[PDB]
Amino acid sequence: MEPIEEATKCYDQMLIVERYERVISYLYPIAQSIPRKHGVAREMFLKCLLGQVELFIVAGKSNQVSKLYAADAGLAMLRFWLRFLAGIQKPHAMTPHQVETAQVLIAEVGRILGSWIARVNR
């Protein structure tokens, strides 16, 4: 059968994305819980959250470390969004527990991105 091959198979992009999918799967529900007001914040958060997948993916296929650092910047911005959604959003958006859970998941993707940046950097 031989599984339908994508071109430019990168382990690191595949792994990172599967692990980041867990971030999305955690955060997307709570990005959608952000009230109507805080809709622009939400749309921007969702574009950060769901759009980091593209950052990873493009990093994977176009092997250029620039794109890997862009992925890191995005993860950094996502970490900002957690801070923002917790603190600055006034109703609630993200319970302290949720930030603690999300940060763990993002940290896992952080690890993998770091390792990937490193293996490419050599």
Binding site: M1, I4, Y11
Partner: protein
């Protein structure tokens, strides 16, 4: 179930099964190249697999054979994710028509029976019966000596679906003498195979207090000369019929302890095995003088499960006194 079993390849390739097979194959493996290369076009992949199986054009990719020494010198042949999924999709339809014929007291790779339900069966069957003696036996090189041929005379009094039969025979050829270790398909067919000796214990031989866990077979008695007979009868059977040499056997009075399944099971206590302790003791000590006293809590929690069964109160006190760490 009426016997027969004549249309399993229809259920094996039901999409709803292959999706179960998929989720079972990927369970835990979701950071592997296999899952991640399959996950891409997962449902288009399963549609070409469903329809390879449903055609009879499935061909098992070669076993990638490595070997680890950390547990024991093994011979671990891995499979491609596609192949482990085909195996999981077989062993979802085919396993429960074998594992249902498996007598109660086989404790290996069958749901709701385990290592720990075995040691408990043994202890228990040791307490009741007031067993005076016991035969413990073991099969030489079990998987590497399974007929793959008189195996398919058992995979074949039960499958009766002549296409599941041909998928079984792709996933595991019907010629040779070596069921591959590191196949779901093979855990099953080894229990099934060693199920033949269970049915020369329980059926012929009328032995009602035994336990088999894959290749190890405890057989509590009361007359140690009878248990020696039983053993001779078992060995003669499993040699002439199954091509299994018995590596070690003994007929001990229940007093030496039945070194069964990681424990040493007297009627009354159930010390674990010194290896386990020493491995753990050393693991702990290492963890302490590695500054890894936080993964040690994970390990400790683990070993506190393997030892909650065993009479490891004194030993848990002892390990708490030596290092302080919360064992239980």
């Amino acid at each position: 179930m009426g016997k027969r079993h004549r249309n399993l390849i229809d259920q094996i390739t039901t999409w709803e099964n292959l999706l179960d097979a998929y989720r079972k194959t990927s369970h835990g493996k979701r950071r592997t190249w296999g899952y991640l290369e399959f996950k891409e076009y997962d449902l288009a992949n399963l549609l070409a697999l469903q329809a390879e199986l449903k055609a009879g054009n499935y061909e098992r990719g070669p076993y990638r054979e490595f070997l680890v020494y950390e547990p024991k010198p093994r011979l671990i042949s891995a499979l491609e994710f596609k192949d482990r999924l085909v195996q999981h999709a077989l062993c979802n339809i085919v396993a429960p028509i074998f594992e249902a014929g498996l007598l109660p007291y086989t404790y290996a790779c069958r749901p709701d029976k385990g290592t720990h339900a075995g040691v408990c069966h043994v202890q228990a069957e040791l307490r009741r019966t007031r067993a005076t003696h016991f035969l413990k036996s073991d099969f030489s090189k079990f998987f590497p000596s399974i007929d793959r041929a008189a195996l398919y005379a058992m995979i074949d009094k039960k499958i009766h679906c002549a296409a599941t039969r041909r998928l079984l025979r792709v996933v595991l050829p019907d010629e040779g003498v070596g069921i591959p270790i590191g196949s779901l398909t093979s855990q099953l067919f080894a229990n099934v195979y060693g199920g033949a000796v269970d049915r020369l214990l329980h059926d012929e031989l009328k032995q009602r207090h035994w336990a088999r866990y894959m290749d190890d077979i405890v057989v509590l008695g009361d007359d140690p000369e009878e248990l020696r007979a039983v053993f001779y009868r078992l060995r003669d059977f499993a040699s002439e019929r199954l091509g299994l040499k018995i590596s070690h056997w003994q007929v001990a009075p229940v007093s030496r302890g039945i070194n069964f399944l990681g424990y040493r099971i007297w009627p009354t206590h159930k010390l674990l095995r010194k290896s386990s302790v020493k491995r753990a003791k050393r693991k702990v000590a290492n963890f302490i003088k590695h500054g890894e006293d936080e993964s040690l809590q994970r390990f400790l929690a683990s070993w506190s499960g393997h030892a909650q069964w065993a009479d490891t109160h004194n030993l848990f006190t002892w390990m708490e006194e030596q290092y302080g760490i919360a064992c239980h």
